[PDB]
Amino acid sequence: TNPFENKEGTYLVLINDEGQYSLWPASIAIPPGWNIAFAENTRSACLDYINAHWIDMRPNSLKD
């Protein structure tokens, strides 16, 4: 099964410099230029965090 498609697993919410959010499997090493916005939790909770925080989906390069 796909690393992200797994429902019964631990996940993470990584945030970008551009303010772009990304789900991430807790087991896999975090890429460079990505910080943890939401710590180890259920996939559903992670997606809820993403839904509740990533309001404006345009890059911060446009925000001023």
Tracing tokens 């345009």 back to the chain, one arrives at 58
What are the residues binding another protein (CB under 8 A)? 1-4, 13-14, 16-18, 20-25, 27-34, 47, 50-51, 53-54, 57-59, 61-62
Alpha-carbon distances of 49 from 2, 13, 21, 24, 40, rounded to whole Å: 21, 8, 10, 13, 12
Q: How far is the CB of 40 from another protein (least distance, A)?
A: 16
Q: How far is the CB of 6 from another protein (least distance, A)?
A: 10
Q: How far is the CB of 50 from another protein (least distance, A)?
A: 5
